[PDB]
Amino acid sequence: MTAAVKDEISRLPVTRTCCRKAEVSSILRFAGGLHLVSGRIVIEAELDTAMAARRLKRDILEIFGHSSELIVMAPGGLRRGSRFVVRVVAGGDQLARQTGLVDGRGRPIRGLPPQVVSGATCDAEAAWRGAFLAHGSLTEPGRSSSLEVTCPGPEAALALVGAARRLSIAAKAREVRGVDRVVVRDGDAIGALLTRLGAHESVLAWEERRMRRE
DNA sequence: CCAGATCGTGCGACACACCGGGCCAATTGGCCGATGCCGTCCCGCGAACCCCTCTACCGTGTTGAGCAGCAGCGGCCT
Numbered sequence: 646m647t648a649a650v651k652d653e654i655s656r657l658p659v660t661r662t663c664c665r666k667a668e669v670s671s672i673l674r675f676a677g678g679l680h681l682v683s684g685r686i687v688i689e690a691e692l693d694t695a696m697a698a699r700r701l702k703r704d705i706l707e708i709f710g711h712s713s714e715l716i717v718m719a720p721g722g723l724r725r726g727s728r729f730v731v732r733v734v735a736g737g738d739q740l741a742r743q744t745g746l747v748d749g750r751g752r753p754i755r756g757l758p759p760q761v762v763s764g765a766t767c768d769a770e771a772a773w774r775g776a777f778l779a780h781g782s783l784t785e786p787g788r789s790s791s792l793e794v795t796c797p798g799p800e801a802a803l804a805l806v807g808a809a810r811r812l813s814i815a816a817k818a819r820e821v822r823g824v825d826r827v828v829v830r831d832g833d834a835i836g837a838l839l840t841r842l843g844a845h846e847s848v849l850a851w852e853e854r855r856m857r858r859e
Numbered sequence: 860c861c862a863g864a865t866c867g868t869g870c871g872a873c874a875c876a877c878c879g880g881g882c883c884a885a886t887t888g889g890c891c892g893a894t895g896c897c898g899t900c901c902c903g904c905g906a907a908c909c910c911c912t913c914t915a916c917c918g919t920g921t922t923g924a925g926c927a928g929c930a931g932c933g934g935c936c937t
């Protein structure tokens with residue numbers, strides 16, 4: 646359902662440096678976290694996609710200059726979902742401070758880094774791409790996909806809504822059962838958004854499926 | 860041995876899923892229209908600001924070294 650979509654997004658080549666930085670920051674913020682162990686900060690990011698973890702590791706090594714481990718052992722323990730976990734221990738504090746998770750010698754930033762916000766539209770769509778790669782789903786249970794992506798806390802969700810607005814694409818933040826996400830319902834916005842992210846074959850398949858079924 | 864955990868199954872509740880209705884709260888944000896103080900400018904005079912002019916006892920002076928060209932001189936040549 647979404648495996649092909651995320652594969653296509655991961656396989657998309659990227660050139661501009663700022664967009665790569667924004668994508669890395671988004672994925673780290675959404676599907677990543679920090680742990681203060683043995684007196685040092687270690688960054689752990691959990692992905693459930695084959696190529697996405699490699700892409701994130703390569704981006705870190707290239708732009709931020711750091712090394713990762715890329716372990717395949719499942720934190721869930723099932724070992725069937727291939728819950729990849731990429732780790733950064735050497736220079737973890739520097740990576741955290743220079744990627745936007747923590748700034749001002751203070752608490753972790755709830756929303757997306759200020760650098761990602763108030764940037765070019767390319768960086769906004771790159772941040773949305775990273776958010777979709779990290780977490781999200783494409784359900785199509787009934788009449789609409791419900792292209793929902795969950796976020797930690799209202800701040801990240803509303804920041805994603807704001808970023809989507811800059812693309813002239815409708816979006817809506819929602820909260821249920823204490824967990825909040827951003828969703829877009831109408832088919833036209835879904836198609837335009839998926840086209841902008843870079844996926845092509847999945848966009849077509851969805852287009853014909855919707856037109857034939859509806 | 861055999862009894863609760865796990866799960867099957869069942870009944871109900873039920874938190875909303877819908878996608879569609881029918882009105883509303885908050886909250887407007889424009890400048891509408893009316894009233895009022897400040898920027899610009901046009902003198903008005905006056906302080907200063909710069910230039911020009913004139914004063915008639917009279918009075919009359921400021922190292923060493925290397926290389927090259929020119930002036931004076933001894934001495935033929937006519």
